[PDB]
Design a protein around this ligand. Structure first.
Ligand SMILES: [Cl-]
Ligand SMILES: [Cl-]
Length: 124
């Protein structure tokens, strides 16, 4: 199986681009990151910053997670992100996504040794 740290990397990091430039960005990335394999994953967020800058959030502002756990951290500054969500016309075998680019603070859950991001909680 894939480790929790590697799964976060695969589902959420896109350091090769500064921001999404096309309305087609989500359909292409969800596919290439293998997120439309078994089913169409309903919602997913990509972060356009370096890996080192995202890992550093684990030492920033400690806050609660939506589930109540206390190993969540909010970034001190805003970051470039892209929200991907299925539209009314999406189906298994024919996934379709809406692309929304924005600049916001990110919130992640951290764990392990080294202590790194393992889950994407939300953006503000
Ligand atoms: Cl997400
Ligand atoms: Cl996640």
């Amino acid at each position: 199986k894939e480790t929790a740290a590697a799964k976060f990397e695969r589902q959420h990091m896109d350091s090769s681009t500064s921001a999404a430039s096309s309305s087609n960005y989500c359909n292409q990335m969800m596919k290439s990151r293998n997120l439309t394999k078994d089913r169409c994953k309903p919602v997913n967020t990509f972060v356009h910053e370096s890996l080192a800058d995202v890992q550093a959030v684990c030492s920033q502002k400690n806050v609660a997670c939506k589930n109540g756990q206390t190993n969540c951290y909010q970034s001190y500054s805003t970051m470039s992100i892209t929200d991907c969500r299925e539209t009314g016309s999406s189906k298994y075998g024919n996934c379709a996504y809406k692309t929304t680019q924005a600049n916001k603070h990110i919130i992640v859950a951290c764990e392990g040794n080294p202590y790194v991001p393992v889950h994407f909680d939300a953006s503000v």
